[PDB]
């Protein structure tokens, strides 16, 4: 309501309109190549910024700060894992997808194994994963930030946000989104940095976070409800391993072997096997631009710890009676949610710390984060649907009808997401961030397992890859459905789940499901006919000519040398930071 907020939001919209118009003036959007792969003309800095901005949504501010507040700094693991896995994308996966000439990752599996059915299955599974794990987290976190910061109707505002991101997605294509994602990356990091600075000032520096956070307990630990009573000291006191990334392998909330192996498997899917991230690399101009873009993305993926997780922890120190509430009736008064108020952590800092002008910048940050992620998911889902499913229904389609169908899918997936909003709003507190990582850990590892065996074991055939995926889905669902039946509850009100389902961490299940999908893929492969695949195997990883029988992934040796040394430097910095906070 202060003019300065409306001017900052208007200036942000003018930047987004302006970079969109410059991209539409520059690029061709009349062809499938142009609209869905940005002409394969994207240099390193939009690749990197777009990888970053398609990944960081409103969920990363709400979820990571909230989990920061609840549980300390090991959720940085979620972000920091990405660093190493984006080097797998640029050096292992992206070369193979460039030499295969794929528009989609289901098409790569069409090329590698050859049936009609793996491509259809992986398209449809991806489309469901985007609704369950990607749209849900964005819509949920948007609605938390609006409820808490603005106070507006959380239906009308999410309809309105979805409608502007629909227009923003359909009006340009992947080329406008990737250039606009350089501006969205700038706004996100810059506003997030200014709020991090105000937050760290309020607790009295970096030292202030680490000497006040283990003390940061609420004074309201006794419920008026009988059979809740005096709340346990485990449920309101901050965890004694709060300052440690690497937590106990059995009793850790995020066990270190689950963090390292289990997230590598799930991140593998997310970064290396999944249309949303990989479409930005498929739009790379060169392999060396994809590799440089991958390093930019890894450096930016270090930034979430300091911009989101540590502000969340500062939110627990400054507002311990509101952010670290445990009494079910106090948490209903604070944030509407009986199970906790950890999700207010980030929006509380914005409300309570930002002046008249910079509140508007923090609305622009959350808008930028939410629009970039939703636009990426809508465009990628459009590509997946158009190219995979609609060319099953209409093979002699042509590049004018396929763009119409691409833009109409964005309208349909917006409508599905509006109809999905009440179901996601039924997730109560910071449970949803666990649900989305649990879903990803139950559904993604079969897909990670097939892409690894698609790229590194040329004997894996179609029967193995398909029945690996389906067996994997069956094993996934055998956990998922039992779990979602029993609920989650909370530390105060435990769920009544057996400890032979929910007892094992979902990132440990991700490990088991990966090796079991993989073992079944190899077993069924070895017990069927070896399919010489044309004889071309530019669909596989090798050092020796990456091929067999434009599509030439040879880069300049000087620029090769540069990105190869910056990847090792970027890993060394990562491993230092893993060492530092372990």
């Amino acid at each position: 309501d202060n003019p300065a907020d409306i001017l900052v939001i208007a200036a942000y919209f003018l930047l987004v309109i302006g970079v969109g118009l410059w991209s539409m003036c520059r690029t061709n959007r009349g062809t499938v190549g142009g609209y869905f792969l940005a002409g394969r003309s994207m240099v390193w800095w939009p690749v990197g910024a777009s990888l970053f901005a398609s990944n960081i949504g409103s969920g990363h501010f709400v979820g990571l700060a909230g989990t920061g507040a609840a549980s300390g700094l090991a959720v940085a693991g979620f972000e920091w894992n990405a660093l190493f896995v984006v080097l797998l994308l640029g050096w292992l996966f992206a070369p193979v997808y460039l030499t295969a000439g794929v528009i989609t990752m289901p098409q790569y599996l069409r090329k590698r194994f050859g049936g009609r059915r793996i491509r259809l299955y992986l398209s449809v599974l991806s489309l469901f994963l985007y609704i369950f794990t990607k749209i849900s987290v964005d819509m949920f976190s948007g609605a938390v930030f609006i409820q808490q910061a603005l106070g507006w109707n959380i239906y009308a505002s999410v309809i309105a946000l979805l409608g502007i991101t629909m227009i923003y997605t359909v009006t340009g294509g992947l080329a406008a989104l990737m250039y606009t994602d350089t501006v969205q990356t700038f706004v996100i990091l810059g506003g997030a940095c200014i709020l991090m600075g105000y937050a760290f000032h309020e607790v009295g520096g970096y030292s202030g976070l680490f000497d006040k956070y283990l003390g940061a307990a609420t004074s309201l630990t006794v419920s008026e409800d009988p059979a809740v009573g005096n709340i346990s000291s485990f449920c309101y006191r901050p965890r004694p391993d709060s300052y440690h990334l690497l937590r106990h392998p059995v009793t850790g909330d995020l066990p270190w072997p689950a963090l390292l192996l289990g997230l590598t498997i799930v991140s593998g899917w997310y970064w290396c096997s999944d249309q949303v991230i990989v479409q930005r690399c498929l739009a790379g101009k060169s392999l060396t631009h994809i590799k440089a873009g991958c390093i930019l993305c890894g450096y930016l993926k270090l930034t979430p710890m300091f911009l989101m997780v540590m502000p969340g922890m500062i939110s627990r120190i400054l507002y311990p009676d509101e952010v670290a509430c445990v009494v079910p009736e106090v948490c209903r008064r604070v944030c509407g949610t009986e199970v906790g108020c950890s999700n207010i952590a980030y929006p509380r800092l914005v409300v309570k710390l930002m002046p008249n002008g910079l509140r508007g910048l923090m609305l622009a940050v959350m808008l930028a984060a939410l629009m970039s992620s939703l636009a990426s998911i809508f465009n990628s889902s459009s590509t997946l649907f158009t190219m995979d499913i609609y060319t099953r229904l209409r093979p002699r389609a042509g590049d004018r009808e396929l763009l119409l169908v691409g833009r109409l899918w964005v309208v349909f997936i917006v409508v599905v997401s509006v109809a999905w909003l009440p179901v996601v709003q039924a997730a109560q507190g910071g449970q949803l961030f666990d649900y989305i990582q649990a879903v990803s850990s139950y559904l993604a590892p079969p897909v990670s397992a097939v892409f690894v065996l698609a790229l590194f074991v040329p004997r894996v055939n179609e029967q193995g890859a398909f029945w690996g995926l389906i067996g994997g889905l069956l094993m996934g669902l055998a956990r998922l459905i039992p779990e979602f039946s029993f609920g989650s509850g909370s530390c105060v009100q435990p769920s009544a789940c057996p400890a032979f389902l929910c007892g094992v961490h979902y990132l440990y299940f991700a490990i088991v499901l990966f090796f079991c999908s993989g073992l079944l893929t190899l077993t069924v492969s070895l017990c069927t006919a070896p399919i010489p695949r044309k004889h071309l195997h530019r669909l596989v990883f090798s050092l020796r000519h990456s091929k067999e029988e434009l599509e030439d992934i040879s880069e300049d040796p000087s620029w090769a040398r540069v990105v190869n040394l910056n990847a090792l430097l970027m890993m060394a910095v990562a491993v230092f930071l893993w060492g530092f906070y372990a």
Binding site: L543, L568, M571, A572, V575, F576, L577, W578, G579, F580, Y581, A582
Partner: peptide, 29 residues
């Protein structure tokens, strides 16, 4: 001390990258 945990992690990583260059130099050529 955090700084020393960081350095020991980096040290071990530079040993593993030296091992990677050793194994591919003698076993791919």
């Amino acid at each position: 001390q955090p700084w020393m945990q960081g350095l020991i992690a980096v040290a071990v990583f530079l040993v593993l990258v030296a091992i990677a260059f050793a194994v591919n130099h003698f076993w791919c050529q």
